[PDB]
Amino acid sequence: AGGTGGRVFNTIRTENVPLMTVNGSSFSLSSNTHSHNMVFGRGDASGHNSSPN
Amino acid sequence: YRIGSYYITEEDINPGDSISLGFGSWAKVTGVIMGTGVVNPDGSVPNAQRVEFQ
């Protein structure tokens, strides 16, 4: 035996790596109708697939 | 080092009546090891010498 005791290579010790999870959260964003800017007018050449404004 | 359960001095008539009797603390450890070294046996640095306080 030895005067100093330790359990590293092989011994019945305690303690481990805890495992936990976080509760489900949903991200909510508001689509503001302003701040979209504007260029040119109507009746005129417009970019295809552009968002209607 | 001498160990005895009788509370009589070594120089007393009841005791052997020779030599000086002094109180001894702790148990005598054989010169070579000092005890606790390494968890897994590797061994620490022991202490030696007589009367030396370390």
Automatic annotation (TrEMBL), chain A:
This is Putative structural protein. The lineage of its organism: Viruses, Duplodnaviria, Heunggongvirae, Uroviricota, Caudoviricetes. The chain holds residues 162 to 214 of 267 of the full protein.
